[PDB]
Assembly symmetry: C3
Homo-oligomer: 325 residues x 3
Amino acid sequence: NTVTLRADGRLFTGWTSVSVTRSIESVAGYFELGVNVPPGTDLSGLAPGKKFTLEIGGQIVCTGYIDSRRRQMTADSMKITVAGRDKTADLIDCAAVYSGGQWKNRTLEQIARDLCAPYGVTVRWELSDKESSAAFPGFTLDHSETVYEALVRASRARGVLMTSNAAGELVFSRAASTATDELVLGENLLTLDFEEDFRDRFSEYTVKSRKGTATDSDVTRYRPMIIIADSKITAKDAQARALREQRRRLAKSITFEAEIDGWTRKDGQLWMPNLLVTIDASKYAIKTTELLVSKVTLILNDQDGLKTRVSLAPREGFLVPVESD
Amino acid sequence: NTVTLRADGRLFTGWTSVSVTRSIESVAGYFELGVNVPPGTDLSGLAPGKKFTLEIGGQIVCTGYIDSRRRQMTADSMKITVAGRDKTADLIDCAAVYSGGQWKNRTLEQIARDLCAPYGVTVRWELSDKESSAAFPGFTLDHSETVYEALVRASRARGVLMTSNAAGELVFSRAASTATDELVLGENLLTLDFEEDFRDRFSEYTVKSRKGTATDSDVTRYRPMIIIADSKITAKDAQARALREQRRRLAKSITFEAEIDGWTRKDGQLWMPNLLVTIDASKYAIKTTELLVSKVTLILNDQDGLKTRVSLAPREGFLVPVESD
Amino acid sequence: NTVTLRADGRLFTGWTSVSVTRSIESVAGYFELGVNVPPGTDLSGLAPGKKFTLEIGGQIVCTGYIDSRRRQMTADSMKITVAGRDKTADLIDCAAVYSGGQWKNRTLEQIARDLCAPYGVTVRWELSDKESSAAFPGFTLDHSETVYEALVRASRARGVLMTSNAAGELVFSRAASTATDELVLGENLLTLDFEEDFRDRFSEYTVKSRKGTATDSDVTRYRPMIIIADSKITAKDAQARALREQRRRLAKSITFEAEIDGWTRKDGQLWMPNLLVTIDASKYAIKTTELLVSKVTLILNDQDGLKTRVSLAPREGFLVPVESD
């Protein structure tokens, strides 16, 4: 639909270039808009630091602060490029700070609340299982680490994913488990780039003399990878690390890059990551099972048209094994 | 004007490709010339290692040694590319060596003299204040560090910049403080690319439990960055490091990339870095204060013409805070 | 001639894109084939993990496992790209594993046998001198290092090169010493790119207080490089390391990139690395001595034709100095 940027209380529309990205791998979506402006156009509202809201046809798709403003000019004209990120960008950028220094008997959601507080970021817990909500006997910050880094460690200790959403909140969840969309070649799926790469896949991963391992049945030949770990590591944290490794490789090994027509799914909602979907390219013998959308890039160009780039990988690659500490 | 390369005592002119760069960030300017040569052309003088002098319309703009020679040929023709750097390149490349191993009650200028001596590089002290010239009770080299690295540490201990000039001398100074040129869009300024990027800017920088901090008023929201430092660090060396960090980010955050017509300034001199200037792009509401030229690239191409690329950033980004050791 | 890929027992031909690379620097040649396929084409045999044999006009040029399969499709057509490497790729990828953990009085060839065994890779010893075959009083693996890394250390301890060949075997040898081919500009040599770069060349290299050095007569001015090494290092392992450094720089400093017509040498054999050759570009005053082929890339494209890319550097750059441990 129509792209609108709400900044400095003002409203900006008419962008000739648009690119909005959001992925699981990150705790912050990114956006970038472009357009040529006639001399004498006030751009005071698109200044870095300005609070913004990025809307499309109405529904908000990103809220945070403007990161950058670029003006390229000649005697004749000027091209402006504005870029920003979800409020959660501060968590990725800045140090973890907590009046105390640690927590006692506090859950992940609770520790996140505290870390997020000074950044004015709200935490969104979308889990309803006992394991993930279990409290941490104790949790301590690690010298100057970012909020994001501290939370990766705690979230990893609870086997949950951390992401962000429009509105700019920190969301805790797990890879979608129910398929809700279908990509069909020739219809909503304009182009599909399916890549199966085993260069970094191993038959068995062994961490460190304590030890633990994870195997990968898809790798037909003997291909071991050894990971050196701390001497004092549970047979559990070993098996977990090993497994994390196997899944990370799976994720990067089996991938689909799809070009969708338009920006919305069948149900009208805008494409977003963490959606389980299926692909049908039968014409080329390709019909897939459950693929998780790891990333989405909504673009608008003159030589690209209104398209969405969707990256997908096996759901299993995004399950977070439980690792202590 | 006309580009001439004086090498092996000979004189070479007629280059079809020319690119000469000099920036504050470095202690050595770089150059590269190109041209197609008819079979049977002696290029023995453009051999790597050959001492050279690069002149433009007369005035020398770079002197050092040829670093490389490239010949690309077909049955029909050959394209030659020669590249070199100021004599000071050796200081960036090679180990710091000193018959003794340390100095006692010696100034920065004096320590530089010694380190530069074996490389046949002359030191140019362009400072006349007591602080910068203060002698070092003691100064010691650090296992295999380069001349450049040793001098960065000592120059940092005196809050001064280190650069090179035509003639290839090591120059000590501070960011220019007097504006002497004006870039006007449509006139001498053909194109301007103004970039304001706050992705790496923080509201406060804190180094390390000793501590010290520096804030950045331009960053409206709470965005802290913690820098872990040695336990035994002065409240001074802490505040200094913190401040260095703030300025380095400023430098990379607010930048202008300008395309100037020709190679000379209004007063006839060739463009060079460390010049305080002002920019006027009023047509697009842009009129700036004092910007320091951090880099200059003089180019000559068939599809570029005779132009100069000038990179500018706030002067304050280039002031060197005093840090001990 | 004709490019055929034997995979899954099947035979695939008609590739529109072909690129096969092999270089000394590596223990595994790489290949990649491309072609557009009509809907309904079975590609089950080109699946990652599949054992393959890459033949050209008959003679095999690479044998190993398929690493990747890529399918790019639109409603209209699909482009397939398959890539693989010599069997030896596993040695570069995987951990060194040995039922014991060490060897006693075993030669390089023997240690390689053992390390290679679980990967089903056969060792090819092409040396007949006493030094290289001398047994190691003792040799021990180093926590999780790859087979390739363990063997680099042992092969370095014997001054020999390690490479791979078609058939996918691990070969031990030394840089070819007899010239067997001549590249002549205008004839078999279509284009030549000769680069002489001294930016990373030093007059003297000194390792670490034990010490040892190597000089480089080609560097006319004083340019020292110091390499910090372990305190307990022989005056021998010092001189050796220093020399390795000098040769590595030589290799990257004086280089020729040549475009050969076709894929075969004069004697009919396909171009391969580790061939001593001479170049004659007299038309441009260039007639070289003995250059070693460090790499070869056999390509077939629509806008490139049937060509071979040959990279060459001074033979001396590839002699492996003896370093203990």
